[PDB]
Amino acid sequence: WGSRKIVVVGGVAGGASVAARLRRLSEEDEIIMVERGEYISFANCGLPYYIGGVITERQKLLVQTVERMSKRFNLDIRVLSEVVKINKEEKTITIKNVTTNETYNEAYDVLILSPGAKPIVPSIPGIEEAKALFTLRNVPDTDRIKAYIDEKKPRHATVIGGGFIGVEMVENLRERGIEVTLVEMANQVMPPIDYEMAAYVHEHMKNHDVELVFEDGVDALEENGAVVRLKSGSVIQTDMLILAIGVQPESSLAKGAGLALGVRGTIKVNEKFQTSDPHIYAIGDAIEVKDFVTETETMIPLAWPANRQGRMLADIIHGHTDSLYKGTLGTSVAKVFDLTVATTGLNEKILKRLNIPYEVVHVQANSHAGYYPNATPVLIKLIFNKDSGKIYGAQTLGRDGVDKRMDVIATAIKANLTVLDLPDLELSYAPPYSSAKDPVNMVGYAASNIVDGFVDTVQWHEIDRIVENGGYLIDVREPNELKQGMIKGSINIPLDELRDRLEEVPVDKDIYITCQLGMRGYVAARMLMEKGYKVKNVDGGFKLYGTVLPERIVY
Amino acid sequence: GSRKIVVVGGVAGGASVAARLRRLSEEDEIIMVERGEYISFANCGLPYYIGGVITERQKLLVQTVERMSKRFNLDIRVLSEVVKINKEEKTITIKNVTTNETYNEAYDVLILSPGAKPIVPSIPGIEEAKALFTLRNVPDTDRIKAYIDEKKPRHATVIGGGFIGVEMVENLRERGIEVTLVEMANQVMPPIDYEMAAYVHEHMKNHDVELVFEDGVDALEENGAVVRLKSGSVIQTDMLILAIGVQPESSLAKGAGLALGVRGTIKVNEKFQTSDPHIYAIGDAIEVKDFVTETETMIPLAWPANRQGRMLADIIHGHTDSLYKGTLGTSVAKVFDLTVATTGLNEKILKRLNIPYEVVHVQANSHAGYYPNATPVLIKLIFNKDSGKIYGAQTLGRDGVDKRMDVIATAIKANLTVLDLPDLELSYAPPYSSAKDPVNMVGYAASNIVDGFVDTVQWHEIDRIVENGGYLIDVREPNELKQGMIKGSINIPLDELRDRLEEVPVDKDIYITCQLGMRGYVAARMLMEKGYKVKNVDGGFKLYGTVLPERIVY
Ligand SMILES: Cc1cc2nc3c(=O)[nH]c(=O)nc-3n(C[C@H](O)[C@H](O)[C@H](O)COP(=O)(O)OP(=O)(O)OC[C@H]3O[C@@H](n4cnc5c(N)ncnc54)[C@H](O)[C@@H]3O)c2cc1C
Ligand SMILES: Cc1cc2nc3c(=O)[nH]c(=O)nc-3n(C[C@H](O)[C@H](O)[C@H](O)COP(=O)(O)OP(=O)(O)OC[C@H]3O[C@@H](n4cnc5c(N)ncnc54)[C@H](O)[C@@H]3O)c2cc1C
């Protein structure tokens, strides 16, 4: 191969990963990495934890130092340097040294854009006057927020936006002993998960004394940001504000060079990360990707994709194209106090938006064998095609073993496995780690029973209307479990008595079954179907129902 | 229509097949026959009950006879031993364990899940060894715990260092009992390789276990209290645990003239049918094909037994038959503060089969190192250099090990290659992983070998190479030289190496080591691009020093 001059814009997830592999592929290339901030390869993801005091050493946030990385990979690394213009027909970029104010042109053979995404700053009246309002992207942002806490001693904080980052900021502020109110315009935290799953998360957040405000936004900031006026008319008195309402692609360099843009102003790229200009590539948060599951054009700002893209791009530049980017699955995970919450693929809200017919199952299973100490429930929601078994997505929550289960399912999806394959994943079993049938196997069996037609089901959001319309709902729990509550219109026939009490089951009504988790309701469903009854099981049983619709519980 | 299905064995395979059969058909008469007092007990929990970790004896009983028989309308017969299959009459002979009285029971379909039994060696004086125990069932467990309570043993000898022997070592140790493990092989845990075992040994020694390798018991003297070893060494002991493996419980099948397989297993086809069309068999008792090479073997594990039972129920009364694609052999054990996991084949088996392979050892953190309490996860991946076919993997460390093994075991069953592992999009936030997971990382390392970006040598090769003209460069920072080096090493720190190229001889084969292998790989890339013939020492000094600590040079 012939040596070229390769210029990388942005020195973090995408830029650093491509630069390092590029060097490993060639000792002769000139490789220049231009970064407007002071630091390269900092741990963006660690920022909230440094604020919370969980990460105690600021220096641990520096994954690579400029000195170390330039020497190791013979990189010309230029921090405090802003690319202000791309000149594509000239094949140069214009760079401003932020320290010295000198500007100059840098010629390139290949230009790689990884400039990321910037926080969305809303036009709220009084936002300019808001003294203690912060966004979180970089190290200076982090220093500033931490300095304010340490020096001004806020007693209450308001977080605007309940995405994965707003939520992590909620936790870390609580960790500092700051009282927290979270304001969300949606009816749930964490857009990636569905409403009934968020119901569990809300419970855990409120149990750690977080005030949750839903279906409300900031209408105005008054008193220099000390008074937050909500759209509804309610008021929050606060000592500081964290804005976490999402991100927008840093595509202004592309727009300025007349490069094609994708959805939501992302930089548009082809299969090889090439922009509309043959010599300019782009990766990371700023680019348009296809989602793995539907191959729909989207924007998914995550670290694994940025790193994977940068890594693959280096190979592609060197003509190693046997493997091209397959799209982004959207596997994500967050710590929420004592809970782990994970997601992959698509949720119900997106699939409805795309007019894609699906089914769901919710299966709660222990992190490991119940007979071994400290087992804890893991809840898996699996979304799939009733006909093909194609997995559209999954969501998981629980105190332990959640990341493991998400990773296996995410692995299965990318390997083009269907729900019918999940029960056949031979996973690691010993008492401290799993059960002879893992939670993943278990959710696979439940989904397979729907695919195979062994069970017909209704959802938590369907059951009440079904009962109003004349559905006969049999609760198969033991009588003592009913003290936890019940679904309105339930008639109690304990599962273990059911086979003896069939005469009590009407053959002139459509039968619906619930238990606590769905498992015993399924067994009852199987029995009744084999006896020639038309029957459906309430997916997730009462435990799920009561979490998402607590106000409808009958005692 | 209706069938009479008789299930022999009421635990993992037997209870699994029985419950699904009922869910499929309300019409069938299902009889489950078990020689012991309990069904569905937690066999796997037994060592932790002995260790006082599982405090409730009652937790060891997963479902009672009465509750399960009611729930699934099962005729469940405990303390009933099937003594004979009468395959011409389609009957079995059952003996009441309490009274020795027998009766016959006809079947339409017969399902054998009788499990496996401990291997008892012929040791002189074993019949006099009052404190010698094997571990299989609840009564065994009660006897062991009773012995400990009544005699307060100061010291215990575990014979056999497999997954079960090691668990017993742990649980006895944590009771304050001194433990000596006696092993015929040069390592504990046959499923893992020697250099990976080195990590387990060190950890066990750190928990004050005495490890005895390449040895065996020649004699038990003074009623088992004196252990005479083949080496000449003598162990004084207060109790012995024999854990030298299990053999299939295939006597019923053998007695009925059914085909047998390797190690006396019950031979079955892809649908678990024996050589008799109305007799099926699942669990530890059966021959399976290993998933990776489709070689006939025996892998006595609970996931397979549970899976086989559900599948067999479907074959009989479910929809489209799924066929068993064999056992991968995914396993995991707790070893004090360590998790040790394996899947597929190890080097010892691959070498025995003369299958060409490469290996990589990649140590990476359980999660991002900038977040608190990250701990190393060592992954060994074994693969084909040409195809990238995964032959097997082993992993160990304090946390995040079960997760990495499960991902890899998923990939293998999904027929992914090492080249696909880097593209697995896993869950990343600081507490859970890194932007490139350990699994991605081991994938990248293996892919570089497959694609020819690096050539490597092993811990067991480097000394000989150095003896025979190899030029070995240690590219660690000088500070990292604290625990020593490989003999003949010349230190040129990676970050200085590009500037000190003149110091690298151009007419010699160059070998590179770092601490974990990553920086040696970077050095190797650099030198290859500069025209040198170079190989990286896989696993670096940390692996080498762990497996060959007596060869470490200061
Ligand atoms: C608080 C926080 C927590 C997060 N947590 C997680 C998590 O747990 N898991 C996860 O997967 N993802 C997480 N992310 C997202 C993750 O950080 C991003 O997906 C990833 O960093 C994107 O990589 P990138 O290279 O596109 O952009 P970045 O990493 O943002 O790097 C882009 C760089 O380019 C520079 N730049 C931009 N324009 C110019 C210019 N004109 N000239 C010079 N330089 C320029 C910027 O200064 C920036 O440093 C988190 C993000 C934040 C903000
Ligand atoms: C101490 C211990 C720990 C273990 N830990 C693990 C672990 O952590 N992970 C793992 O994957 N595996 C583990 N195993 C192995 C696991 O228990 C087996 O793989 C699994 O139980 C096999 O299921 P099976 O149905 O074939 O046999 P079993 O579960 O053993 O059931 C066989 C039953 O059949 C009965 N039987 C036999 N013959 C007759 C007859 N003629 N008439 C009536 N009944 C009969 C036996 O009494 C026995 O109860 C462990 C085993 C032991 C002993």
Ligand SMILES: CC(C)(COP(=O)(O)OP(=O)(O)OC[C@H]1O[C@@H](n2cnc3c(N)ncnc32)[C@H](O)[C@@H]1OP(=O)(O)O)[C@@H](O)C(=O)NCCC(=O)NCCS
């Ligand atoms: C660290 C960073 C610069 C990447 O640089 P890198 O040199 O690729 O470092 P990595 O640790 O990713 O190294 C992986 C390489 O080492 C190899 N490797 C790792 N361990 C190995 C071992 N034990 N033996 C041999 N090779 C090993 C891999 O095969 C891979 O090589 P390849 O890419 O040539 O195939 C970049 O990921 C970064 O800046 N990260 C922090 C920023 C970020 O991700 N932010 C988002 C929010 S957290």
Ligand SMILES: CC(C)(COP(=O)(O)OP(=O)(O)OC[C@H]1O[C@@H](n2cnc3c(N)ncnc32)[C@H](O)[C@@H]1OP(=O)(O)O)[C@@H](O)C(=O)NCCC(=O)NCCS
């Ligand atoms: C437990 C045992 C009796 C099997 O009985 P089982 O009724 O199959 O119990 P499981 O929990 O395995 O099965 C759960 C069933 O409910 C379904 N299910 C579970 N949760 C559900 C939910 N929330 N909603 C709907 N269905 C659910 C599963 O799909 C499965 O049904 P299917 O097989 O018809 O698809 C048996 O495996 C056993 O004896 N185990 C312990 C012994 C052992 O494994 N020993 C080895 C050493 S530990």
Ligand SMILES: Nc1ncnc2c1ncn2[C@@H]1O[C@H](COP(=O)(O)OP(=O)(O)O)[C@@H](O)[C@H]1O
């Ligand atoms: N005579 C013997 N003395 C000591 N150890 C032995 C002897 N025979 C076999 N072993 C060892 O016992 C271990 C048994 O491992 P494994 O097959 O897992 O048994 P189990 O399933 O009972 O744990 C192996 O490591 C094997 O090398």
